[PDB]
Amino acid sequence: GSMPPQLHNGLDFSAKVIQGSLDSLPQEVRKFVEGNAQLCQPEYIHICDGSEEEYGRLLAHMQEEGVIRKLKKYDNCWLALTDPRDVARIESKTVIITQEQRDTVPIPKSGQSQLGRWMSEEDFEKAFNARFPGCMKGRTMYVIPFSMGPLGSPLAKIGIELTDSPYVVASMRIMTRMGTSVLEALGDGEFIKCLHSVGCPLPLKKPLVNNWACNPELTLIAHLPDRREIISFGSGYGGNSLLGKKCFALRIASRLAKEEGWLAEHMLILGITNPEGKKKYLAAAFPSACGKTNLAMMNPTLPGWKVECVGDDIAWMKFDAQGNLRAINPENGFFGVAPGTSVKTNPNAIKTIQKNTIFTNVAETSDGGVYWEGIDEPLAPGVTITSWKNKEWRPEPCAHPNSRFCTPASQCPIIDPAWESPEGVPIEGIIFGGRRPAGVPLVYEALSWQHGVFVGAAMRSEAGKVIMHDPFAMRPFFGYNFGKYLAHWLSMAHRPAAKLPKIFHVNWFRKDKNGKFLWPGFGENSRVLEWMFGRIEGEDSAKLTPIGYVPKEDALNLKGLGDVNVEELFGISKEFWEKEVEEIDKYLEDQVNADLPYEIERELRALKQRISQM
Ligand SMILES: Nc1nc2c(ncn2[C@@H]2O[C@H](COP(=O)(O)OP(=O)(O)OP(=O)(O)O)[C@@H](O)[C@H]2O)c(=O)[nH]1
Ligand SMILES: O=C(O)c1ncccc1S
Ligand SMILES: [Mn+2]
Ligand SMILES: [Mn+2]
Ligand SMILES: [Mn+2]
Ligand code: NA
């Protein structure tokens, strides 16, 4: 862009650019960079090119400073340990700004909305002014041009993220497609403006904990969809600071999707091939901590079946002119929960993460390896453990429960051959599910599209234990009014040509009276996928129940599993389901209230009626 006029010398930041050129940026990109440089007052501006050289030297620099540590047991892997105050998404500090609250969340009948957190324009302006002015003093502002989705995909969207965090730059290189080719692709087109600061201008006003810059007290993750802006302050945790990951991927994108006729969802996408050489793509929405990444990367136990991964967390889906629901993974890597990852639960992740991977908040072994609860593999005698709190550790956990790996998707040994195809992959089934220790069978199939949207809406999951509502696995992620999101989903049925995928609901987590899992899960979930596959093909493998279709007796391949109690696992109790429908009723009435579509109320009535006839 052109240099700003000025009567002095404070508006043109060209002299502070240490990589790239403001003159070579598209005009609106310059305005965005320079405007926020004027506000935040960085010492330098670094326009990222996405090169390996850039990445390597950035990592070595963070290593110099003791912000990250190299994990010498592996190939170009690194470890970051955070301030324990900055370890996860903070829902109560995550907001969406719109002129009217109702555009962001439905106005609940009696209670406080659980479906979003609206902040008024006025309150945000005040919050912004109390945080950003001068916030990058002494620091580099990195400019990260990135694509969500394969570059030039009709489904891809571009952002520009400004950050003062080299951790964010590195992790964004993994999780998005970033650098100079994106700027060239963008040209004078539209982009999402993403502004991030850790909120710790130099000289530091407060002590740095574990060399991890953050400002917990002023942490605020804001989304301004009508301005195409994401503005995040105070947190370096990836869900808050890698603005592609959730802010763009789900919150802003779900609104774009609403406006433009597509869907942005908290879904893995996998391809599954059967022993007759037929392949189908499925998407699945489970809440956080409910096993999407395991499913997405599944190593199936059934001989002759293959699973390949398109993505593990976000799906952007659009019906094409032929009526196929075409999906892309708009991400470039996996940002996956480390604890519980083992050769038993996710052998393909174990494979993936030993090269070119950044770990955050896991334990470190004395030989430069990684450790966490549930890794389920022993250390040689001699090898010792430093916890994620940077203390010597022996059996508090050694790793934070939301510690994660950040790894390139291209390295997954079962990455799908079409995982970067710009036209996307055709989704033939959508799976919902969560943690239900009681009452909910292993798998059922919705009766219709409308029933299936109700099934998404009615999702609940265990957090004494609390069973929480998490509709579509989107509860913390809706970019706009959920009622209107339901209507948008329902509207897909009225597209002539649309080939509506079959909708299923699974429960890997049903327990017997002793608290033991009824179902072995993991690779054994391939048997559930086989049933779904056949159902999509039209097989006569279902029996009707009040909640939807379930597998016929003998329909599920249980060879290996005579130990498994199909009776308790597929049991449907009138008493449980009477209570279930009442809770769903109460929830939807309060939380969706005047914006609850007729079709969803109708499905509630119908389920009530079917249960009444038991
Ligand atoms: N019993 C059982 N537990 C499973 C299964 N699949 C995954 N899990 C559990 O799910 C948890 C791991 O899931 P996460 O990686 O936290 O889930 P996610 O959906 O990818 O979460 P986000 O990345 O936060 O969106 C661990 O507690 C696993 O043991 C299964 O088939 N059976
Ligand atoms: O909480 C989430 O679902 C999540 N998922 C993937 C990666 C990061 C986060 S914050
Ligand atoms: Mn997630
Ligand atoms: Mn995951
Ligand atoms: Mn309808
Ligand atoms: Na640290």
mmCIF file of C-alpha atoms in Angstrom, residues 24 56 60 263 271 292 296 369 380-381 402 473 532 612:
data_model
loop_
_atom_site.group_PDB
_atom_site.id
_atom_site.type_symbol
_atom_site.label_atom_id
_atom_site.label_comp_id
_atom_site.label_asym_id
_atom_site.label_seq_id
_atom_site.Cartn_x
_atom_site.Cartn_y
_atom_site.Cartn_z
ATOM 1 C CA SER A 24 4.302 -4.618 -1.420
ATOM 2 C CA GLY A 56 13.894 -22.469 11.906
ATOM 3 C CA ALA A 60 16.146 -21.105 17.532
ATOM 4 C CA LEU A 263 -21.721 -24.847 7.409
ATOM 5 C CA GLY A 271 -12.612 -41.454 4.792
ATOM 6 C CA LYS A 292 -12.861 -36.799 17.831
ATOM 7 C CA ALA A 296 -10.393 -39.246 12.934
ATOM 8 C CA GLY A 369 11.304 -37.046 25.123
ATOM 9 C CA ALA A 380 13.994 -47.227 30.783
ATOM 10 C CA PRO A 381 15.567 -47.365 34.189
ATOM 11 C CA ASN A 402 -5.396 -29.918 28.288
ATOM 12 C CA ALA A 473 -20.629 -29.885 19.949
ATOM 13 C CA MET A 532 -23.214 -46.928 9.389
ATOM 14 C CA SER A 612 -45.049 -42.716 25.745
#
